[PDB]
Amino acid sequence: AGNQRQGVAFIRVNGMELESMEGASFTPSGITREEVTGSRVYGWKGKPRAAKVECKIPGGGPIGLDEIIDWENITVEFQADTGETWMLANAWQADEPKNDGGEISLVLMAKQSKRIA
Amino acid sequence: AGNQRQGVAFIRVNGMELESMEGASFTPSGITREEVTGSRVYGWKGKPRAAKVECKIPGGGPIGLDEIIDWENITVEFQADTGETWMLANAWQADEPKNDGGEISLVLMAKQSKRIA
């Protein structure tokens, strides 16, 4: 809004909004720039990057864990409470999913994310 | 001032002052001196260094994240509240930008910084 800052974020997979915990991460897909020095400082150098979305889901919810561990081609939407939205298409569930005391960690990853709306 | 010490720092990119969090870093560009010992202590040895500016920006602000991840040739100005100013020209956004709970980390980097004003 006029002075509103981002306090919470919403993550939606295939239209189902996920019961996400506090502290949800988001890494846009782009170019990672490194540093080059020889006898002096010369410039930077690029490296491709992949979009990542991280969150935590309580256990026993509407969405089962077997469904979570079987996501290969899904649509992930990351929306901030202020109104900023990013869309991830053909995403997949990466890393090892674990149910640690009712906490399930999602590492939903995609090869390209664009800022819609 | 007469007894004023640095309490806060302001970072401005292309004239837009950034909404920076507490604890903003700044590494001047110069020569890093190492240590040389053989059978005795002989002296030091140099190595080039690159200017770095680090800060954090809240999510949902006036400046979008897509703009942040697309900075290749920008002007970065680091000014202390007391009056010390450093200018970074032809800077770029380095490392991986992440939106972790409304926090965006900037690693704005340049190959040379001079103290203006």
Place this chain on the structure above:
Amino acid sequence: SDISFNAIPSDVRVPLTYIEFDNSNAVSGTPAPRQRVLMFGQSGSKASAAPNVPVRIRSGSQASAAFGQGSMLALMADAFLNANRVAELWCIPQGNGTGNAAVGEISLSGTAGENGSLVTYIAGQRLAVSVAAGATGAALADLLVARIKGQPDLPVTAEVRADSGDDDTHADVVLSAKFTGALSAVDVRWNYYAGETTPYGIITAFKAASGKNGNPDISASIAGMGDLQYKYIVMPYTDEPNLNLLRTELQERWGPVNQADGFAVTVLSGTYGDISTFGVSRNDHLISCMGIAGAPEPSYLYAATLCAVASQALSIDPARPLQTLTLPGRMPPAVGDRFTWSERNALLFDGISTFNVNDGGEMQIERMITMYRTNKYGDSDPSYLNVNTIATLSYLRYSLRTRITQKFPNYKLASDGTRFATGQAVVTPSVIKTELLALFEEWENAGLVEDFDTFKEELYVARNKDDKDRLDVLCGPNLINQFRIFAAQVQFIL
């Protein structure tokens, strides 16, 4: 529409490959906004281009068709395109001027007593006719007339004439130019290269015309140029009435109002004294003239080639000196007609540029300077002397304009020390100070300015107390030096 296609319909639907052959070597019409040049020249009869109207020329054949074969402008355009194929070329024709079309006559007499060849150089073009034993002057004149009629690029027409009670061998050829003007006169030589000689018993002579012609007026042409930025201008007419208008227009464009920088390159052909007098007379900082004596080719060809080379070199880099660049296809004068070291030094001190002759037959630029010699009060002034200075100043102005109009499209002005805080799109004189410092860093890294601390200490940015919407800045750059003179002293021990 960049490539002009012939006999290929624009509405073709058969999927295949269409290949055409054309002898003329056209130039790609890629826009070059930073390399727009303009050329002034005369057009002869049978021309299809309206006078005082600029037209884009991209091939020699197109120029010849538009301005007529053998015209001044067509030859100048061909010379420019034979050396620079990257810059935009615009040519605007002129009128006809005042004077007479006659330029002189070539007198041939005597009889040849041995086999040989007769080589005549008219306007820098070699014309060779075989000479047989016992041949008379009249037959050689007829062969020369036929050869001249064969050549379509000569800006002269030749007719045979024989009269008087002299021997039948004598017969002189009358030459008439294709246009009227001060540059209609041409040069005639019979031996330029080594191993060439007149056959024995043949007497050759050339008598120039007595009348004097005048260059056509350029007021309509200078008024109809347009509003584009022509960075370089080619003016062959070296006369006071035209140069005054050109200087007025250029100095009106050079001012902070128009900001459309322009430069003019001219070449003057004549004796050393005349060149020195002209250079002393003119005191403009926007025109550079190169003096040459006894040039086999007309002056405007040299002017076109020099302007093309200089434009390309300065567009590549505005600070690199023009010290050893060569002019392709331009014949240097004779050995006895070249200026000595003292003459070249005096010409450089008199505001006249000088050239040099390579170890072979190539002609190379030596040093390019402007006509500016005297301060406003009458003292000597080394500023505005080298063409590199003007080029660098123009580039700096363009870069500053681009940076200001790009980084700050439309902002709001506030005084220094006011508390505006984050978010607002206001500009403080300190902001402009920092942006100018960054631009200066870019300039220094590009290799244009040398000293940074002095520039920073001499900077001053402030608001205007009357306009309230105008920001006044006073800056001084230290233009970098050029490597010109290498003085050495050798102390041998033997």
Place this chain on the structure above:
Amino acid sequence: SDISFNAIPSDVRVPLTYIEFDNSNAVSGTPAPRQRVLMFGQSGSKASAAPNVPVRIRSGSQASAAFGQGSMLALMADAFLNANRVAELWCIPQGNGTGNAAVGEISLSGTAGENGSLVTYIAGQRLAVSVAAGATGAALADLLVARIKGQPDLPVTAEVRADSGDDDTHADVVLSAKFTGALSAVDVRWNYYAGETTPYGIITAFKAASGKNGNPDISASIAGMGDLQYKYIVMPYTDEPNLNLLRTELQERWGPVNQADGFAVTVLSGTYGDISTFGVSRNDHLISCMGIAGAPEPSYLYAATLCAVASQALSIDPARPLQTLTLPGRMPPAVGDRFTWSERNALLFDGISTFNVNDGGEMQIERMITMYRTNKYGDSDPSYLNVNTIATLSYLRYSLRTRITQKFPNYKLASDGTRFATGQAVVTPSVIKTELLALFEEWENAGLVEDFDTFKEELYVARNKDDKDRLDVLCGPNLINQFRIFAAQVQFIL
């Protein structure tokens, strides 16, 4: 209106960027109320500035245009601006004085027997003319006259003259200054740097004028200065009638009534005895003079440079000694014309400041002291000696005035011990006591005063028993010392 714009209209509405190039290097007109200085100087003919009227000068070209090229004031302003670009500069022209414009003649005779060069230094300006084998003195004189006419910054005019029954080689050049005064005479040298010599067979000599000139009156100029506070004043006229008026005005300003502190910096050129006599004669604590013998450059240039350097240094800090600061662009005298250690020590004991020559060719300040030498009863007095003392006293007075006028704009006075209670805006002598103690703490932290307990014990604040609206305070500060002499003794063991 801080930046003077040329050819740029003040009423422009097209939104764009306007860029102009100007050769003159102007100085920003930022106000500097604490660094206002005034300069006295003569103006030659063709001047456009009204006499006895102060004008703000911000560039060398503006000064030259206003006071005429080659004038004393223009050269002084250029010298000041070449070393100090932060202080406000005000220049007030003078009249013409009495005397004659002739300053001497340069006599050249003989013939050159070898190739070489002739270098003549007139008023500290190098003038080199090429010398050819067999050249006569008359030709060299003509070349020298042409070179002098070429140089517009020389405050002399040169004419050639040849007569008498001597050889045709002999021909002397007559020099005439651009203004009349005691400083119109100049110095002429033929060899200043190493590796320079007169060509063999050439005899050169200089004969100075016999008449004596007088400095113009400054009564109108000193009356028309205004009411501003000129902290530093440049006076080149070293004569008793002018210095008496300057001393009267300065001591009237130095008093507690006017409170507009001012200082004057002068340079006297002459023999050691004359400098010593002048220093002994003058006994003022508001004027500092530096003595120099055999100076290639005129005295006022040294005065301007020294005043600029001293003003900047004292404005940065009033307590830092002036021990190693260098004077940029000022040529030191010859090796045999520099004062020895004993001469410098005697000059310092005689109230004359001394300079020093750096390891290279740079001239540096050695120690700056005032003319004050003698107590009122005739005894010796070390007070009011160093310029740092006067600067510190002026700064302390200004700071105390500012603090009193700021913390207590308009109050009401009550006696000590009265019961006024909270709320009322009355002031007690104890309040002023505490405020003075706090200001003294600030002064000590700033690095100006050393001892606090003694200052507190010597303080005394009381009301006046007659005015009833005036508070009388008597305080004594302990001005901090400066590190001048480092005495060492080495006891080697070998």
